Amino acid sequence: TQLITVDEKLDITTLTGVPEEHIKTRKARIFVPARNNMQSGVNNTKKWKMEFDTRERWENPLMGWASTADPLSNLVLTFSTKEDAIAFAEKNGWSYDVEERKVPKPKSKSYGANFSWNKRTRVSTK
């Protein structure tokens, strides 16, 4: 046979070594990151990311540096699809929420529409 049938939910939380505080009190956010509106390039909007809720950052009394106590504060994960991210968060016991991908809707462009005979879409200058 050499194959067993495990009909249970996949759960590796006892094997990851993550302490309980950072399994059951964390909210994973699964999202495609928004395009930086300083720029027109879209190559950062191609993958799904997983991040966590930001915890407390405070001021170091000596230097004024940003002291943290959150180990997961920099943990950003990359996924090809939404279902891979959902499956990875369910496998690790993370409570998650998913934002759907926002695509830009197809616009209707026409250079001649800048010079219409009777429509408001004339450009006053060019």
Partner: protein, 134 residues
């Protein structure tokens, strides 16, 4: 005075003018001893001996779903029907229109920059007002 969290300092449900529920995320934490707002009200309920049946943000949102379930379906506009029944109920008591003309409280760009407590504390908005009033 109970120091609370601002919109950048809490994961928090806000519903816009079209009924779409949306949630902020925590960007930074509230300064000093300030706390998240329902945490303050829930701790006040526990001090008063009338402890409200939620402990976490998800349980507050379960209560929020119990009062109206649209408040937890994010980026969704639930359509509201029944204009006819509201219009029939509006025909009951005939209130009289005043003779005052419809004047909005914001006529110029001067009135735009300071409306809430964050904008009134804003030095940039103060410079915008001083720049448009000169």
């Amino acid at each position: 005075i109970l120091p609370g969290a601002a919109y950048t300092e809490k994961s928090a449900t806000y519903v816009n003018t079209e009924g779409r529920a949306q949630q902020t995320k925590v960007a930074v934490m509230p300064p000093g001893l300030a706390r998240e707002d329902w945490k303050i009200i829930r701790a006040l309920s526990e001090i008063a001996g009338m402890t409200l049946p939620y402990d976490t943000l998800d349980q507050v949102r379960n209560r929020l779903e119990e009062v109206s379930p649209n408040l937890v379906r994010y980026d969704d506009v639930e359509g509201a029907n029944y204009f006819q029944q509201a219009s029939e109920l509006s025909k009951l008591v005939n209130q009289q229109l005043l003779a005052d003309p419809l004047v909005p409280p914001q006529l110029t760009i001067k009135d735009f920059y300071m409306t809430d407590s964050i904008s009134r504390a804003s030095q940039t908005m103060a410079k915008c007002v001083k720049a448009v009033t000169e």
